[PDB]
Amino acid sequence: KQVRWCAISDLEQKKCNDLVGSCNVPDITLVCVLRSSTEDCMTAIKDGQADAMFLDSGEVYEASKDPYNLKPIIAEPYSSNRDLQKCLKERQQALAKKMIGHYIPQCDEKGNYQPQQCHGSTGHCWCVNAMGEKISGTNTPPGQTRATCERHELPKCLKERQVAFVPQCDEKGNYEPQQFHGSTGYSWCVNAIGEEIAGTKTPPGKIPATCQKHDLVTTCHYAVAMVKKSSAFQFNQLKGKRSCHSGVSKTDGWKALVTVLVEKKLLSWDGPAKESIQRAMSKFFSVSCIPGATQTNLCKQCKGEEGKNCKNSHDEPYYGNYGAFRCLKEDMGDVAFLRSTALSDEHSEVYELLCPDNTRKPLNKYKECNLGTVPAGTVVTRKISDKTEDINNFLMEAQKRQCKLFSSAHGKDLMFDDSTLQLALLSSEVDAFLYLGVKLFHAMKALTGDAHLPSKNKVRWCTINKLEKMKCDDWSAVSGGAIACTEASCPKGCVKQILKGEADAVKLEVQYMYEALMCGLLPAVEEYHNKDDFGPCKTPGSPYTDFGTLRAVALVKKSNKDINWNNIKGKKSCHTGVGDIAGWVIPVSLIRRQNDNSDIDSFFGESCAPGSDTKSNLCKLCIGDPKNSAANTKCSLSDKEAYYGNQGAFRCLVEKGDVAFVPHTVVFENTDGKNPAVWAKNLKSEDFELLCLDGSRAPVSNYKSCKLSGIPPPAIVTREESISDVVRIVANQQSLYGRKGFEKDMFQLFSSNKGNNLLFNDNTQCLITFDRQPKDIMEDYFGKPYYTTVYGASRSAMSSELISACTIKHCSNSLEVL
Ligand SMILES: NC1=N[C@@]23[C@@H](N1)[C@H](COC(=O)NCCCCCCNC(=O)c1ccc(C(=O)O)c(-c4c5ccc(=O)cc-5oc5cc(O)ccc45)c1)N=C(N)N2CCC3(O)O
């Protein structure tokens, strides 16, 4: 009902009051809370005095910690080579605007961009590629011969696959990060456009380099140092010069400059714990104006009146990018540190750029003459996110109603960056770490002084609940300084903690490994489940035969001799539940491979898969809880469904089903003599068979050959630099706390009075070290069957916020490179 925006200056207050007066959003009233600086506004948000503000990207990290605890919620989206169905989305966005006579993009029936795009209000037309980028020069006004538009959509990867080393592309035609040459055994990493990254080519038999994912994005901004052409100094002569800065906490005014200076060995500085950055900067420059600074000389060149001087606020006339430009223009500094948004061609006669290679270049060369790329600022609120919905609704309705959000007659860059075109809602999972990305988050953490000093003799294990926390505390009290404990809420949280340097290693099931392998984490050890061969556990190096890995199989009855793999369409099937690997991952992936229609909702007849749509075919004949008529527990992803789990799917097969997609074990767990006493009392394993991929049948004991696929073992993973430091300690803690260890009467690693299946699965025999083979990490872990079946041997099969945070953003002037 109400949204309070915090303004840091008088001009922002005027713009916010103008928006309150002019922008009319139904059921939401805007309120303008005035503060004197950016930090005061962050504090007012922390105290519940305000609701949301806009922060520079560099200010995000310090915003996620005491005494602020804020999180980014609303950010400007960028265009990339990963945007699928961009035309339909942009047309829907344009049609949602309460305005007449604007450009609504035109798509075809399939949903792609029509090669010719016209602006109906003006009559102008132009040509456009697959991503909607205007072909240069094709803009024609009405009454003039139109430019004939061609069809430019064939990506570079598929075009290089033709006329042919054969590159590997994904399902969308993008370059896979890892390229493997078939003629000569070589592996390397490539750019988002296919350019080979240096230092990644590896001969055969050698472990390939881990390739990182790349996304090609456009409309990037940079941190630049502007100077006047009348001056003559270069970059390595900034010592003792007068400097103008946009702000002490902004990337384009401080952080990028600090990074470049410390890498070029120009700034005499010890460390964040030994000396503050501001002291080294005060000793570096002579007199400067750096808004928000705490050293007097770094505030001498500012023009703010008494009580307004050197504040992170437009009350200081030298604050911001345009403030730093005015600082340079009025001859109070020799170099301004700002963002490429403040550049213009009207300044290309008096001003130029100061590049870190000790040369000067004109402004238009800012892509080759900068201090680094600057990510877009974001609208942040309290981490508890008690107002995110109202703020989002207000901003979205203000954008749809064409309110003056990103411009003002009172000034520039007020409330938001003027360069902003559109604000979108971020996923609730996005914190400062997910917003900045792994590398940039670690850079901010090291710059602020929170960089963890790694210890090569202590492993920080990450837990997912209080029971695992208790077991880990036992292990830490009994380990003698070798094991410490961190707490998280889920395995993905532990992966995030490891990527942030807050933890060291954690155990993950297979369904969590993909993202973990996408972010550069390597499997340190793996659980061994062979309960009949202790050989590999008693002495390392013993060649293991079976790792105890489960094998997904399609179990049928000997009675029905008409169910083969090539006629499972329309048959009644049973699943353990939506999400399970052997129950609803291997079979659905296989079916989606062979049947190009790709519709499991209509593939089977009346299948029973707990967790699907209660009205769909995947939820029929599921008897949910026999003696509970006061509730409707059909298709429940819990034990309230009698056909849930391995035993539940086996009962579904026994009672009403034809085939069950289950691990190979349940057949022996509910037949023979080892069986329950309800529906499997006189059942035998010799009355069932397994369906093989070639369309034949096999006995149940033939699961090592007649199987759908194999499941990789749960992997205990860590970072690369910690690999050699983890495994050792594991061994050191296994021979003491394993199943046949020296101190197994003090703590058993694979059992606990605190709970079942804590830290590791309680049926684990031991932890075998990962033998790194010279092939792809994804392949080496999953197995080429599993890889090619589930993820199609592609790094683009899944997309999440964590994967985006582990992706390099390759800037480019356009996506026209195809
Ligand atoms: N670094 C590393 N990696 C392994 C390994 N150590 C351990 C697991 O080792 C064990 O536990 N012992 C069992 C194997 C010991 C060797 C016995 C001879 N077997 C193979 O050499 C073999 C290995 C992997 C695969 C695979 O599936 O890719 C296949 C295999 C095929 C290869 C090409 C092809 O067209 C078809 C294939 O078809 C299959 C069909 C099947 O039906 C069943 C298996 C295959 C064959 N843990 C991991 N997480 N790893 C990750 C990947 C990995 O497996 O290499």
Swiss-Prot record:
Free-text tissue specificity from the UniProt record: Plasma. Highest levels of transcripts found in the liver, the lung, the pancreas and the brain.
Domain (Thyroglobulin type-1) ranges: 84-149, 154-211
Subcellular location(s) per record: Secreted
Region described as Absent in transferrins: spans on this chain: 86-216
Disulfide bond annotation, renumbered to this chain: 6-41, 16-32, 87-107, 118-125, 127-149, 157-169, 189-211, 244-327, 289-302, 299-310, 355-369, 462-494, 472-485, 519-806, 537-766, 574-652, 608-622, 619-635, 692-706
CDD domains, per database record: TY (cd00191)
Domain Transferrin-like residue range list: 3-83, 212-449, 459-795
UniProt cross-references to Pfam families, sorted A to Z: Thyroglobulin_1 (PF00086), Transferrin (PF00405)
Domain of life: Eukaryota
InterPro entries linked: Thyroglobulin_1, Thyroglobulin_1_sf, Transferrin, Transferrin-like_dom
Gene Ontology cellular component list: early endosome; extracellular space; plasma membrane; recycling endosome
One GO BP annotation of this record: antibacterial humoral response
Keywords annotated in UniProt: Disulfide bond, Repeat, Secreted, Signal
Family: Belongs to the transferrin family.
Its biological purpose: Binds specifically to the neurotoxin saxitoxin. Its physiological role may be to transport or sequester an endogenous organic molecule other than Fe(3+). It may participate in a detoxification mechanism for neutralizing a microbial toxin.
PANTHER family: SEROTRANSFERRIN, TRANSFERRIN
Complex formation: Monomer.
Name of the featured protein: Saxiphilin
Organism: Aquarana catesbeiana (American bullfrog)
Lineage: Eukaryota, Metazoa, Chordata, Craniata, Vertebrata
